[PDB]
Enzyme design. Structure first.
Site, PDB file in Angstrom:
ATOM      1  CG  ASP A 351      -1.799  -1.228   1.298  1.00  0.00           C
ATOM      2  OD1 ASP A 351      -2.787  -1.319   0.538  1.00  0.00           O
ATOM      3  OD2 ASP A 351      -1.496  -2.106   2.133  1.00  0.00           O
ATOM      4  CG  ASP A 703      -4.649  -1.004   7.538  1.00  0.00           C
ATOM      5  OD1 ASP A 703      -5.313  -1.437   6.571  1.00  0.00           O
ATOM      6  OD2 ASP A 703      -4.713   0.180   7.930  1.00  0.00           O
ATOM      7  CG  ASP A 707      -6.680  -4.910   3.619  1.00  0.00           C
ATOM      8  OD1 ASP A 707      -7.364  -4.825   2.577  1.00  0.00           O
ATOM      9  OD2 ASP A 707      -6.279  -3.912   4.256  1.00  0.00           O
TER      10      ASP A 707
END
Ligand SMILES: C/C=C(/C)C(=O)O[C@H]1C(C)=C2[C@H]([C@@H]1OC(=O)CCCCCCC)[C@@](C)(OC(C)=O)C[C@H](OC(=O)CCC)[C@@]1(O)[C@H]2OC(=O)[C@@]1(C)O
Ligand code: NA
EC number: 7.2.2.10
Length: 994
Positions: A351, A703, A707
């Site tokens: 990310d 996080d 996910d």
């Protein structure tokens, strides 16, 4: 109802047939409970202690050891003699290892926690409902809640189930959906239906999700789904269905056991085939009871000689120490076997925000309209210094310091940033720096207006804490904020309704201040602020505005742009419905463009080089971001993922673009993509699958619970240290500093460890090869046992354990990250290396056997026994005249075994040095390159002499202290093993390196 968000409140009540005022009837509760079950995730498989112990004896090698323990126990039982002090020792030690091995396996499951159970941290014990059997609210167990139930929540409550909001009793309702995502920024809910049936949870503004918290307010709703049917339950099911394969090393080790089993069995047949000649021996005479014990004694020894008993302990030790080492480099590895997999990482999907960047927003540029005169147009661009949240910086026009107050356009500019804002600043007296209060984006606006100071307020006289919100407070006293229209991704903007201060008896003078994504906002601008004046929005001017925005976002600046507009004549306060967020875009029309701010989320200082390391290491890096495709690509070029001038039309995709592709073109896209923008919730898992379909060892960051399935699916799920507890438990590694550079550092460390792991793995197994040959030779030739199980165990666990462990501290190659990722299918031993250990093993097998045979014959302390009688030593007790001379008990002497053992020990000490490098000679890479190794060898020998002199010990291992002459013979036959391997290394370096 799984699509209750698209249905009206009346339709949801109609569906279940429930009254909002009374609630479910007791019969309805019964029927709904029986139909949908209880509101709870299913309990995990309660693995019992007994079932856990059994699993420790499911491995093939530990079953062979278990069988070899039984034969040893039986042989220790059915025997003639009075010296049992060294009889039941052998089967007991083998059992001890199995038990100790079983103890460890239980200790792990006792401390191991899966992420599926971590989800149950988010289901509250109690929940408040309204049912027809009572007037007031009754708090019951959350598991007893069923779909159709009328539930009530308030601030502090943890949401018990997926709930369709019916009525919001308080003024507003804020919900903390932080367990889903990462942004702990509370979101505002409403009761109006969301038209799209396939809407993502972020856009379901009328739903409450099980596990989230009510940040503020109080509302009433009807339960849509429960248990596994909830958003968090649907995630639990995805994780449960996800099957994680074993690490490549575990698959090779498992393979090794399968084949070692075959070999062990083959040898036994070989021993039988060699001794077929016993079928031509007379039935009368000899001892079939002693002939059987012999074939069973060597069988037990054969097993022990084959299994690297110390290997699973050495592996674990190396990984645990490497883990401690990685921890200091901000990398918290959670699973020990994941260290290898980490070193094989071919693709890293990270990310952007917080990981590739600092998540420390800062307004760098901004521009207002300077002049509009027909086809002619001029803007007023500015620059701002200071990348921190501190109000320390100035505003520049063409690199020249200017006063913001001298520009009327900038005054209105700052006004919007201060009022259209839910964030603030705060000077931390503990840390000594300015920290943010709210969103990083909005706080960047808070910092900006403090640097501009359009009213030239005396701020150099204030303290440090009062300095934080100075220029902001000045603007707040001008306009009174009536209400705010929250942000929503459908219109991608937010606004605030404000009235003038001095206006107690007036209804004219209100203003709306809008901010958000440039495209949508500018399209709703029919006017343009030029200082204090206003002109109608025209074609050429609008293009001039959009061009600069394109330049700032797609250029090397890589800025996130926000458009700021004001509605000069907002609709009347009464003609606005503040509950219907669908009408918000309408309320934000006929705007007047004021300006545009550009802010930077700067990449980490170590990312630039870390990306390059990956390119050197053949590791592909994929960026996942929330930026638009244009800015996403621009940021990739900036950090070095993309070349500054290379084509990326087929290497960068949005979520929508990815969905519009067929399944075949999607799999193809993932093998060449390096940039994913505006990704949809299900895409992270899909990308991993596609990457895995190309056999890529995939690393993935996340996080939130959203996910979690992706983190579990990827070979190396990576969680943030600031991340959620579930995400962490669902991952293989945790970034303590959230830094992308930590990942790369971990992979390099992962490579260094496995290279050293390759060494002591090959070193130990090489020893077992030589031991087996010794057992085979002593069985084939019919010789007395040179090495016994008790001795071999001490070697494999202690004597060879210490050098093996030290080999894990071998200095890493300098070109670690200048090489491609290792193929998972790459065998540990093959080709010429297979031949080398095939030779070394044959050497060891002959040397150890030869050392024992040497004592029986050409030794002064030994007898003058010839070879012909040494092979028929079992016939000496009967056919005495054939072998007339000394006692028959001399064939069980401790001296020849000590000679064999000492030779075995010494050779393995030499072979340990041979394991410092695969091909490089000791003349090129000296033994003292590894100081730890030399120290281990000294300890191993000190322990060898320990079991040779300390009286209780040589009796157990059946050993006797060697004479100086005998020790010399050991060195005469051991040491040249270095020369043998040196030659084999020489052949490898000069006649195979093509
Ligand atoms: C302990 C003693 C030996 C017997 C052993 O390990 O068994 C073999 C066997 C299991 C393989 C072989 C061993 O082969 C032999 O030694 C056969 C000769 C028999 C001589 C006796 C006279 C009748 C390994 C050990 O040989 C040497 C030459 O290196 C190498 C390698 O091992 C590895 O790559 C390491 C395993 C992680 C494996 O071929 C391996 O199996 C395959 O799956 C691998 C890929 O594993
Ligand atoms: Na995983």
């Amino acid at each position: 109802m799984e699509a209750a968000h698209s249905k009206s409140t009346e339709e949801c009540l109609a569906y279940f047939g429930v009254s909002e005022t009374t609630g479910l009837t007791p019969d309805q509760v019964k029927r709904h409970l029986e139909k949908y079950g209880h509101n709870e995730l299913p309990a995990e498989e309660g693995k019992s202690l007994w079932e856990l112990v059994i699993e420790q004896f499911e491995d093939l090698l530990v079953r062979i050891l278990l069988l070899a323990a039984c034969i040893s126990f039986v042989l220790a039982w059915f025997e003639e003699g009075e010296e049992t002090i060294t009889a039941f020792v052998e089967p007991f030690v083998i059992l001890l290892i199995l038990i100790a091995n079983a103890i460890v396996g239980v200790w792990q499951e006792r401390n191991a926690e899966n992420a599926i159970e971590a989800l149950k941290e988010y289901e509250p014990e109690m929940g408040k409902v309204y049912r027809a059997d009572r007037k007031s609210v009754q708090r019951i167990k959350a598991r007893d809640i069923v779909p159709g139930d009328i539930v009530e929540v308030a601030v502090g409550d943890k949401v018990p189930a997926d709930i369709r909001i019916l009525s919001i009793k308080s003024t507003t309702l804020r919900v903390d959906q932080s367990i889903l995502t990462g942004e702990s920024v509370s979101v505002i809910k409403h009761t109006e239906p969301v038209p799209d049936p396939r809407a993502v949870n972020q856009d379901k503004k009328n739903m409450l999700f099980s596990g989230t918290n009510i940040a503020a307010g109080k509302a009433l709703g009807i339960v849509a789904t429960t248990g596994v049917s909830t958003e968090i339950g649907k995630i639990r099911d995805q994780m449960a269905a996800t099957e994680q394969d074993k690490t490549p090393l575990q698959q090779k080790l498992d393979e090794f056991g399968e084949q070692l089993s075959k070999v062990i069995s083959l040898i036994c047949v070989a021993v039988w085939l060699i001794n077929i000649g016993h079928f031509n021996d007379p039935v009368h005479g000899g001892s079939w009871i002693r002939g059987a014990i012999y074939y069973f004694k060597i069988a037990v020894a054969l097993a022990v000689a084959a299994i690297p008993e110390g290997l699973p302990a050495v592996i674990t030790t190396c990984l645990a120490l490497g883990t401690r080492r990685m921890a200091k480099k901000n990398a918290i590895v959670r699973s020990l076997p994941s260290v290898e997999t980490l070193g094989c990482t071919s693709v890293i999907c990270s990310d952007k925000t917080g990981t590739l960047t600092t998540n420390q927003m800062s307004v760098c540029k901004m521009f207002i309209i300077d002049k509009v005169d027909g086809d002619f147009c001029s803007l007023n661009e500015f620059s701002i210094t200071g990348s921190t949240y501190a109000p320390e910086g100035e505003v520049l026009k063409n690199d020249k310091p200017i006063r913001s107050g001298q520009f009327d356009g900038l005054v209105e500019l700052a006004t919007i940033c201060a009022l259209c804002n839910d964030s603030s600043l705060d000077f931390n007296e503990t840390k000594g720096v300015y920290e943010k209060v709210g969103e990083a984006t909005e706080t960047a606006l808070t910092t900006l207006v403090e640097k501009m100071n359009v009213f030239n307020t005396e701020v150099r006289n204030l303290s440090k804490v009062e300095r934080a919100n100075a220029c902001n407070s000045v603007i707040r006293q001008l306009m009174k904020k009536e209400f705010t229209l929250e942000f929503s991704r459908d219109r991608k903007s937010m606004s605030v309704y404000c009235s003038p201060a001095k206006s107690s008896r007036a209804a004219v003078g209100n203003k709306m201040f809008v901010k958000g994504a440039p495209e949508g906002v500018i399209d709703r601008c029919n006017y343009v602020r030029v200082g204090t004046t206003r002109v109608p929005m025209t074609g050429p001017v609008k293009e001039k505005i959009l061009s600069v925005i394109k330049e700032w976002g797609t250029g090397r600046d890589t800025l996130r742009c926000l458009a700021l507009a004001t509605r000069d004549t907002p609709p009347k306060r009464e003609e606005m419905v503040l509950d219907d967020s669908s009408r918000f875009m309408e309320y934000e029309t006929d705007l007047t463009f004021v300006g545009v701010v550009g802010m930077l989320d700067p990449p980490r200082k170590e990312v630039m080089g870390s990306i390059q390391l990956c390119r050197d290491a053949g590791i592909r890096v994929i960026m996942i971001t929330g930026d638009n495709k244009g800015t996403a690509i621009a940021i990739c070029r900036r950090i070095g993922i993309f070349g500054e001038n290379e084509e990326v039309a087929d290497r960068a995709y949005t979520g929508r673009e990815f969905d519009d592709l067929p399944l075949a073109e999607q799999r193809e896209a993932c093998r060449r993509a390096c940039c994913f923008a505006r990704v949809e919730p299900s895409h992270k898992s899909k990308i991993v699958e596609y990457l895995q379909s190309y056999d890529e060892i995939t690393a993935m960051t996340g996080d939130g619970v959203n996910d979690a399935p992706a983190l579990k699916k990827a070979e190396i799920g990576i969680a943030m240290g600031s991340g959620t507890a579930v995400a962490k438990t669902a991952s293989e590694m945790v970034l303590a500093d959230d830094n992308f550079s930590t990942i790369v550092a971990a992979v390099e460390e992962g490579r260094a460890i496995y290279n050293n792991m390759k060494q002591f793995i090959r070193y130990l197994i090489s020893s077992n090869v030589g031991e087996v040959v010794c057992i085979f030779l002593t069985a084939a030739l019919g010789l007395p046992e040179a090495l016994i199980p008790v001795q071999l165990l001490w070697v494999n666990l202690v004597t060879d354990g210490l050098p093996a462990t030290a080999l894990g501290f071998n200095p890493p190659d300098l070109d670690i990250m200048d090489r491609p990722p290792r193929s998972p299918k790459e065998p540990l031993i093959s080709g010429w290396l297979f031949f080398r250990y095939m030779a070394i093993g044959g050497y060891v097998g002959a040397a150890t056997v030869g050392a024992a045979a040497w004592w029986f014959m050409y030794a002064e302390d030994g007898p003058g026994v010839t070879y012909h009688q040494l092979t028929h030593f079992m016939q000496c007790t009967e056919d005495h005249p054939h072998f007339e001379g000394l006692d028959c008990e001399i064939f069980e002497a401790p001296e020849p075994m000590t000679m064999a053992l000492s030779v075995l020990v010494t050779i393995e000490m030499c072979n340990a040095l041979n394991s410092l490098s695969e091909n490089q000679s000791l003349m090129r890479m000296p033994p003292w390159v590894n100081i730890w190794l030399l120290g281990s060898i000294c300890l191993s020998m000190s322990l060898h002499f320990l079991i040779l002199y300390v009286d209780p010990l040589p009796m157990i291992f059946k050993l006797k202290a060697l004479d100086l002459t005998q020790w010399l013979m050991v060195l005469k036959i051991s040491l040249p093993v270095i020369g043998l391997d040196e030659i084999l290394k020489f052949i490898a370096r000069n006649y195979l390196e093509g």
